[PDB]
Design a protein around this ligand. Structure first.
Ligand code: BEF
Ligand SMILES: [Mg+2]
Lengths: 381, 402
RNA sequence: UUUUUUUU
C-alpha cells in the first residue's frame, strides 16, 4: 500500500528494499518492482474534470504521492470533492471502497444540497475529574446537538484552546460513533503538534505561515469531506480554531468590491465563510454535520466584532468565556448569561429544561465571577 | 593570504605591503593578481544562488549584497555539495582571466559531512523547553531590565517573541539589553542582529555594544535592500539550525520589514485596507522560521513590533503578527514619559506554555506576583516592581523573600 | 490605485 509505505520509516523500509532488490524515490522504486498494489486518499476534482487523491498527512496539499483520477471514474460513481477512495493503483487503476463502503451504494444517494435540514434533535451530552467541570457547565449553559452550528467566543489568553481540547476529549469519550476531525486555520506550529498528540481523530491544520489561499483551500477540503459523509448518513463533528482567522483569510482572498463594512471587512468577504460555517446542519434523511468554531472578541480589533456579530446571525449556539475570570485564574471561565442555545427545549427533557431555566434566572443577577464560583462549588458537591 | 582579510586591513598596511610585491579595491586586487603569478589565495562569504543557477559569495561588510569582491560559484559545486542559499563557504579562489576552485569548509564544517543533512523544512517544531535566563546577576543598572523580563515573559530556545510598544518606548534599548544578556549568559548561542530600515546611529552603536554579527540596513537604503538583507540573514540562520546550532535573531523591527515588502512586492490582485495581501505573507515566512527543533538545535527570533503610531498600516501589520508570536513583551509610553525604565507593561506581557521554561515553584511565585500587580496601574506596577527588586541583587534571593 | 467606503 502506498500510504502504509509512506508511514513506514526508512530504517525498516530499506531492509525490505534489500530483500526485494530519498524516501520518495526509494518508495517509488519498491512500488514499481511489485507491479511486475493499492493506495488511497481524498478526491479533489480539478478544472480539467480530472482528480487527485490528496493525502491527509500533507494536509490535503498538492503532493507528489497523489493518485491521478480519471474523469470517467468520476462519471461512473458520481464522485465529488471530499470523497474518500481506496483502490489498487501514480494512476488509479480500480476502486474498492468509496467513503468506507461499496462503490455501488455510493451511486444512489441524496445530494447534500437536497438533504432536508432540521434543528438539532439528538443531544451530544458532554468521571468526576476536574476537567469535567468545563464539560458539565457546558451542558447547563448551552446544549449541543447533532448538526449544531455553535461558536466558542472568548478574549485571547482566556482558554479557547483548553475548551476545544476538552470538548474533543469528551466527544471521543461519549460519542466514538461520531466522526471527529479537528481543523486548525492560521494556527501556531507549536500548538498544532500538541493538538495531534492528545486528540483522538484526524487533525487537519494550516500554520500561520501559510498563505491565505492555503487556509481557504484546506478549510474547503475538510468541509466538503464532511458533506460526503453526511450523504452516507454519518454524524460528523468539526472543531475549528478559529472561524475568525478563517474569515480574515477569506477577506484577504475575496476580490475588492469597492465597498468596505465597518471594521475593515470587505462587503463580499463574509459570504464564503458563511457557507463553510453554514454547512453544519441536522438532516432527517440520516446523519448530521456539527461545527464548533471559536470566535475572537474583546481583542482590540473592530474587525473581529463585525465577524462575530455576523456569524451569530448564522449560528444557533454560543458559549462565552470571560477574561475577568481568566484573570481570577478560576476555571471554567464561562459567562453564563451571554451563553445560550437556540431551540434548546428539543435537546433537553422537560424536567431538565425546567431545572436549567430556573437556574439561569438565579445566575442572571449574579456577577460573572460569583456566578461561576457558585456553579463550580455546586458541581463539586 | 586572504581576500576578506586583505580588504579588512587598512590602506596604509595595504599599500606598503603592495610596494614589496590607486583605489583600495584595486590595491587588494593588484596584490592578489601578483600573488597568483608568484605561484601562491583564499576567500570566503555567504552563498546566494541566483535564478540563473549560479551563485556568488556575498560579503558581510557589503551586508550580503553584490560586490566587486564576490566569488563566483559554478553550478557544479551546488550539485556536488547540494548547496542552498545561506551556506557559508571558505576555500581557495583565483582572479578572473573572482572564481572558486575548491571549498575547504561549508558552514564551518567539513564539506563531506555537510553534503548529507536533514532539511530545515523537515525539522519538527515544538514548544520552547530550554530556558534562557536574561538576568546577568552583575548587579548592574541594566540588569533591572533583564530581571523584570525574566519575571514577566520568559524566553527559551526556538522562542518566537515580539517587543510591542509605541515609538520612543524603549524597544531598541530592550534588544540592546537582550544581546548583552545573550552574550553574557549564553555565549554558546549564535547571535545575529538584524536592523531593518532604522536610524544610522543605531546600527553603529549596535555594532560597538554587543559582540556578534550585526547585519543592518539603515533608512538611507531602498526598500528592495531591506528585503534582500533579511532574506540572506534568515536563510543563513536556517542553514546553521540544520547543523543543530542554537540560533538567535534579534530583529528591529518587524513592522519596518513588513513595510519594505509591501513596497517591493508586485501589486497584488487585491489591496487590503493600505497593505497588500501577498505582501504580508513574506514577513510571516521570515518570522515563522522561529521554532524549537526536536531533532536538534533551535531558531529564536525576538523582533520589535510598533503600535500606537497613528498609522493604520502599522496596526494591520501588528494584527497579523499579534497571535503569531508565543512570547510578548509590551512597553508603555506613559511609563516612558515618566522616565521610569524599563517601561514594561507587566500585565500584557507573558509567554505561552511558560510552565516548560520555569520550575514549578518559580511558575507559582510568578503567578502570585502577577496577581498582586494585576490591580495596579501600569506606572504603579513598574515602580512597585523595580522597588522590590532594588532590595535584591538576583531574582532568586527576591523569590525566597516571598 | 486617489476621492467615496474604511472613519470616528
Ligand atoms: F521610534 Be522607535 F524606535 F519605535
Ligand atoms: Mg527603535
Amino acid at each position: 500500500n502506498l500510504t502504509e509505505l509512506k508511514n513506514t520509516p526508512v530504517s525498516e523500509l530499506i531492509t525490505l528494499g534489500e530483500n526485494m532488490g530519498r524516501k520518495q524515490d526509494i518508495i517509488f522504486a519498491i512500488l514499481k518492482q511489485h507491479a511486475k498494489i493499492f493506495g488511497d486518499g481524498v478526491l479533489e476534482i480539478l478544472q480539467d474534470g480530472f482528480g487527485f487523491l490528496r493525502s491527509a498527512d500533507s494536509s490535503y496539499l498538492a503532493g507528489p504521492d497523489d493518485i491521478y483520477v480519471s474523469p470517467s471514474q468520476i462519471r461512473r460513481f458520481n464522485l465529488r470533492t471530499g470523497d474518500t477512495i481506496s483502490g489498487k493503483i501514480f494512476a488509479l487503476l480500480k476502486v474498492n471502497e468509496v467513503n468506507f463502503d461499496k462503490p455501488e451504494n455510493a451511486r444512489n444517494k441524496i445530494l447534500f444540497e437536497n438533504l432536508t435540514p432540521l434543528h438539532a434533535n439528538s443531544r451530544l451530552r458532554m468521571n468526576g475529574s476536574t476537567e469535567d467541570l468545563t464539560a458539565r457547565v457546558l451542558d447547563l449553559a448551552s446544549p449541543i446537538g447533532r448538526g449544531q452550528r455553535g461558536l466558542i467566543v472568548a478574549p485571547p489568553k482566556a482558554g479557547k484552546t483548553m475548551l476545544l481540547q476538552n470538548i474533543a476529549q469528551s466527544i471521543a469519550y461519549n460519542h466514538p460513533d461520531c466522526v471527529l476531525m479537528v481543523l486548525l486555520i492560521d494556527e501556531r506550529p507549536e500548538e498544532v503538534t500538541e493538538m495531534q498528540r492528545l486528540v483522538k481523530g484526524e487533525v487537519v491544520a494550516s500554520t500561520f505561515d501559510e498563505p491565505a489561499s492555503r487556509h481557504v483551500q484546506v478549510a474547503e477540503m475538510v468541509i466538503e469531506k464532511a458533506k460526503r459523509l453526511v450523504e452516507h448518513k454519518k454524524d460528523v463533528i468539526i472543531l475549528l480554531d478559529s472561524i475568525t482567522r478563517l474569515a480574515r483569510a477569506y477577506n484577504t482572498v475575496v476580490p475588492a468590491s469597492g465597498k468596505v463594512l465597518t471594521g475593515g471587512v470587505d462587503a463580499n468577504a463574509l459570504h464564503r465563510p458563511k457557507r463553510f460555517f453554514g454547512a453544519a446542519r441536522n438532516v432527517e434523511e440520516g446523519g448530521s454535520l456539527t461545527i464548533i468554531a471559536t470566535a475572537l472578541i474583546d481583542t482590540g480589533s473592530k474587525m473581529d466584532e463585525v465577524i462575530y456579530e455576523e456569524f451569530k446571525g448564522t449560528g444557533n449556539m454560543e458559549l462565552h468565556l470571560s477574561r475577568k475570570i481568566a484573570e481570577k485564574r478560576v476555571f471554567p471561565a464561562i459567562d453564563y448569561n451571554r451563553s445560550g442555545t437556540r431551540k434548546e427545549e428539543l435537546l433537553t427533557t422537560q424536567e431538565e429544561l425546567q431545572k436549567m431555566w430556573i437556574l439561569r434566572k438565579i445566575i442572571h443577577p449574579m456577577g460573572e465571577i460569583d456566578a461561576m464560583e457558585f456553579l463550580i462549588n455546586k458541581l463539586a458537591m
